[PDB]
């Protein structure tokens, strides 16, 4: 099927019509998305089949066809771009300066942008166009606004 590098929608025909359940990144022949989007299930790309290769429910990440390839990191200082892919709408870059998720295990960047749940898995980019993480696992704050972690995996 299609193995070209880029951002992809993750769709299903189980519900009414065609429904977008999430988004992902194809890089070096590996498809990268969030675990909650596919629940680890196989994917189709035209007539080709993508099988899960690695996954972790706690990190909320999964890779298909090979190990996780994304290893760029937020520098903790510069603005970033969310390459948002909303259901039924065109891909759109949104620039923001990340906030911080402070945890008992260390600090993580966070992007304060609100999109429908089917936008989960949209990539977050640095100034060179490198994917520093995926958008779509976070919290709802005091004012009802969504704040997502910049979720990144480990490249072996």
């Amino acid at each position: 099927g299609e193995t070209t590098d880029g951002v992809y929608r993750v769709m299903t025909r189980r519900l009414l019509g065609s429904t977008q359940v999430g988004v992902g990144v194809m890089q070096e022949g590996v498809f990268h998305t969030m675990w909650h989007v596919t629940k680890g299930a196989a994917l189709r790309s035209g007539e080709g089949r993508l099988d899960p290769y690695w996954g972790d429910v706690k990190q909320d990440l999964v890779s298909y066809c090979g190990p996780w390839k994304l290893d760029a990191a937020w520098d903790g200082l510069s603005e970033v771009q969310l390459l948002a892919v909303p259901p039924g709408e065109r891909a759109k870059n949104i620039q923001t300066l990340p906030g911080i998720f402070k945890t008992k295990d260390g600090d993580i960047g966070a992007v304060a942008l609100d999109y429908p749940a089917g936008t989960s898995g949209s990539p977050i980019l640095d100034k060179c166009g490198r994917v520093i993480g995926l958008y779509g696992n976070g919290v709802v704050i005091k004012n009802g606004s969504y704040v997502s972690a910049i979720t990144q995996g480990k490249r072996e």
Binding site: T12, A42, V57, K58, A91, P98, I100, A112, V139, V147
Partner: protein
């Protein structure tokens, strides 16, 4: 069954729309991968 559809190239775009704030939040991550606000 689930399928994928290409939606674009991954590039930084000059003159993108700039929005969103930068909050500092104390959070916890459970065994199920769910974040929660700690106060």
């Amino acid at each position: 069954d689930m399928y994928i559809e290409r939606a674009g190239d991954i590039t930084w775009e000059k003159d993108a729309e700039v929005t969103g704030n930068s909050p500092r939040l104390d959070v916890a991550l459970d065994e199920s991968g769910d974040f929660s606000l700690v106060e």
